[PDB]
Scaffold this motif. Structure first.
Motif, PDB file in Angstrom:
ATOM      1  N   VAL A 186      27.735  95.302  11.354  1.00 58.46           N
ATOM      2  CA  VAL A 186      27.155  95.770  10.274  1.00 58.46           C
ATOM      3  C   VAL A 186      27.798  94.964   9.143  1.00 58.46           C
ATOM      4  CG1 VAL A 186      27.269  97.935   8.800  1.00 58.46           C
ATOM      5  CG2 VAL A 186      27.465  97.978  11.362  1.00 58.46           C
ATOM      6  N   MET A 187      26.947  94.448   8.079  1.00 57.70           N
ATOM      7  CA  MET A 187      27.451  93.619   7.062  1.00 57.70           C
ATOM      8  C   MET A 187      27.474  94.290   5.906  1.00 57.70           C
ATOM      9  SD  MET A 187      27.616  90.709   9.241  1.00 57.70           S
ATOM     10  CE  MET A 187      28.061  89.160   7.760  1.00 57.70           C
ATOM     11  N   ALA A 188      28.425  93.809   4.852  1.00 58.31           N
ATOM     12  CA  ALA A 188      28.220  94.381   3.495  1.00 58.31           C
ATOM     13  C   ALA A 188      27.778  92.984   2.478  1.00 58.31           C
ATOM     14  CB  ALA A 188      29.512  94.947   3.019  1.00 58.31           C
ATOM     15  N   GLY A 189      26.975  93.270   1.861  1.00 57.13           N
ATOM     16  CA  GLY A 189      26.451  92.449   0.644  1.00 57.13           C
ATOM     17  C   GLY A 189      26.863  92.820  -0.381  1.00 57.13           C
ATOM     18  N   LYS A 190      26.725  92.087  -1.600  1.00 58.29           N
ATOM     19  CA  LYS A 190      26.993  92.595  -2.834  1.00 58.29           C
ATOM     20  C   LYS A 190      26.879  94.020  -3.184  1.00 58.29           C
ATOM     21  CE  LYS A 190      29.270  91.265  -5.273  1.00 58.29           C
ATOM     22  NZ  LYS A 190      30.003  91.511  -3.985  1.00 58.29           N
ATOM     23  N   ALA A 191      25.303  94.567  -3.127  1.00 57.09           N
ATOM     24  CA  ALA A 191      25.247  95.731  -3.371  1.00 57.09           C
ATOM     25  C   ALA A 191      24.068  96.224  -2.172  1.00 57.09           C
ATOM     26  CB  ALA A 191      24.462  95.884  -4.721  1.00 57.09           C
ATOM     27  N   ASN A 192      24.452  95.743  -1.012  1.00 64.90           N
ATOM     28  CA  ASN A 192      23.780  96.173   0.236  1.00 64.90           C
ATOM     29  C   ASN A 192      24.525  96.343   1.608  1.00 64.90           C
ATOM     30  OD1 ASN A 192      23.729  93.582   1.959  1.00 64.90           O
ATOM     31  ND2 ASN A 192      22.673  92.807   0.596  1.00 64.90           N
ATOM     32  N   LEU A 193      24.029  97.108   2.471  1.00 66.31           N
ATOM     33  CA  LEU A 193      24.461  96.985   3.764  1.00 66.31           C
ATOM     34  C   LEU A 193      23.452  96.750   4.937  1.00 66.31           C
ATOM     35  CD1 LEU A 193      26.215 100.512   4.339  1.00 66.31           C
ATOM     36  CD2 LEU A 193      27.165  98.302   3.835  1.00 66.31           C
ATOM     37  N   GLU A 194      23.874  95.746   5.535  1.00 59.76           N
ATOM     38  CA  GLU A 194      22.874  95.106   6.633  1.00 59.76           C
ATOM     39  C   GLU A 194      23.249  95.464   8.150  1.00 59.76           C
ATOM     40  OE1 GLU A 194      21.932  90.913   5.748  1.00 59.76           O
ATOM     41  OE2 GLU A 194      21.137  90.759   7.626  1.00 59.76           O
ATOM     42  N   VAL A 195      22.308  95.863   8.991  1.00 58.38           N
ATOM     43  CA  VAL A 195      22.593  95.748  10.470  1.00 58.38           C
ATOM     44  C   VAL A 195      21.683  94.723  11.254  1.00 58.38           C
ATOM     45  CG1 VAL A 195      22.616  97.155  12.435  1.00 58.38           C
ATOM     46  CG2 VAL A 195      23.180  98.317  10.272  1.00 58.38           C
ATOM     47  N   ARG A 196      22.276  93.946  11.874  1.00 61.05           N
ATOM     48  CA  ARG A 196      21.595  92.704  12.823  1.00 61.05           C
ATOM     49  C   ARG A 196      22.444  92.698  13.924  1.00 61.05           C
ATOM     50  NH1 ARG A 196      23.580  87.407   9.250  1.00 61.05           N
ATOM     51  NH2 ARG A 196      25.404  87.305  10.283  1.00 61.05           N
ATOM     52  N   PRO A 197      21.392  91.978  14.885  1.00 60.08           N
ATOM     53  CA  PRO A 197      22.183  91.690  16.156  1.00 60.08           C
ATOM     54  C   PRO A 197      23.251  90.653  16.029  1.00 60.08           C
ATOM     55  CG  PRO A 197      19.901  91.481  16.534  1.00 60.08           C
ATOM     56  CD  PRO A 197      20.109  91.664  14.931  1.00 60.08           C
ATOM     57  N   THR A 198      24.178  90.759  17.000  1.00 58.46           N
ATOM     58  CA  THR A 198      25.352  89.875  17.043  1.00 58.46           C
ATOM     59  C   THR A 198      24.800  88.156  17.047  1.00 58.46           C
ATOM     60  OG1 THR A 198      25.853  90.416  19.148  1.00 58.46           O
ATOM     61  CG2 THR A 198      26.855  91.333  17.651  1.00 58.46           C
ATOM     62  N   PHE A 199      23.691  88.159  17.865  1.00 60.14           N
ATOM     63  CA  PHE A 199      23.350  86.834  18.121  1.00 60.14           C
ATOM     64  C   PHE A 199      22.646  86.067  17.033  1.00 60.14           C
ATOM     65  CE2 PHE A 199      19.339  89.380  19.475  1.00 60.14           C
ATOM     66  CZ  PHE A 199      18.605  88.872  18.555  1.00 60.14           C
ATOM     67  N   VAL A 200      22.708  86.661  15.740  1.00 58.49           N
ATOM     68  CA  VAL A 200      22.171  85.938  14.511  1.00 58.49           C
ATOM     69  C   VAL A 200      23.379  85.150  14.051  1.00 58.49           C
ATOM     70  CG1 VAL A 200      21.659  86.373  12.128  1.00 58.49           C
ATOM     71  CG2 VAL A 200      20.633  87.709  13.993  1.00 58.49           C
TER      72      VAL A 200
END
Length: 280
Positions: free
Chosen positions: A173-187
């Motif tokens: 789970v990543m936090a951008g400036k005004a966002n939350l993102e979920v992506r695979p660890t392999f990215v």
């Protein structure tokens, strides 16, 4: 900061090494940053340089890029020896293979169902927010929401995802400036780079005696981090950022511009038996 790449030291270890590993970002690294992505179609010089490097079977040459699979294949795919990693680790082509693997489709993306459910819930309850769905990454956007309440909702949503989804699937789970993102660890490019080094196996004498890893951006930093964790002898590994000496980096060296990167690879190419003869 870093000193500029010591080209004499590089060339010396290149000549000594029986097996070599190259990992290059493409944009900003092999070619200049541009607005129009088509303007960063590899020049003939860049392509010649890569083809010559990859022709030597002692070298394993990888391009690790955010570009589409179709872009890398169209413009660099005619060099059969190149390993290609496209679309942020989602597509991979091994050296000398015609086959692309879809790493997203090879994974269990069941996490996407739960993340959508959670994001939809918070979207209905956070005016102005919306969901961006890509192939492999899901992003919750909330810049148009009330700033304080948006940030609060994002902290609460993030905690929820970390304690549930991220413990069941291999995602982050990543936090951008005004966002939350979920992506695979392999990215993560470090994941990509560590995987490449470990593919050689756990035998020291089988490891490459030369690694050159080049990149200009924040994501490329993870490659440098991974190599610092590789367990390889320090003098065998050259993690090199593209940027200024004063740039803070996980790399040990820098080259100022893509032109310097191409010049450096040309120097290595010119140590070939054929080129050494022609040079006299």
């Amino acid at each position: 900061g870093t000193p500029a790449l010591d080209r004499a030291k590089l060339l010396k270890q290149y000549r000594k090494a029986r097996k070599r590993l190259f990992m290059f970002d493409y944009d900003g690294t092999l070619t200049p940053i541009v607005k129009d992505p088509q303007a960063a179609i590899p020049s003939d010089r860049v392509l010649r340089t890569l083809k010559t490097l990859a022709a030597d079977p002692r070298n394993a040459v990888w391009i690790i890029s955010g570009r589409d699979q179709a872009f890398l294949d169209e413009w660099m795919g005619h060099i059969p020896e190149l390993g290609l990693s496209a679309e942020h680790g989602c597509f991979i082509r091994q050296p000398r293979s015609d086959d692309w693997e879809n790493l997203a489709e090879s994974s269990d993306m069941g996490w996407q169902k739960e993340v959508m459910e959670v994001f939809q819930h918070f979207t209905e309850r956070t005016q102005g927010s919306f969901i961006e769905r890509k192939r492999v990454a899901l992003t919750w956007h909330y810049r148009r929401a009330d700033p304080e309440y948006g940030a609060f909702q994002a902290r609460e949503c993030r905690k929820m995802l970390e304690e549930t989804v991220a413990k069941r699937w291999e995602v982050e789970v990543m936090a951008g400036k005004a966002n939350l993102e979920v992506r695979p660890t392999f990215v993560n490019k470090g994941f990509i780079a560590a995987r490449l080094v470990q593919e050689y196996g756990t035998d020291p004498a089988q490891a490459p005696e030369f690694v050159l890893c080049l990149g200009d951006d924040f994501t490329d930093e993870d490659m440098f981090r991974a190599l610092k964790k590789s367990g390889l002898p320090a003098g065998h590994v050259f993690s090199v950022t593209v940027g200024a000496s004063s740039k803070q980096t996980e790399a040990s060296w820098h080259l100022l511009e893509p032109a310097d990167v191409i010049g450096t690879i040309s120097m290595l190419n010119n140590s070939s038996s054929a080129q050494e003869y022609l040079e006299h």
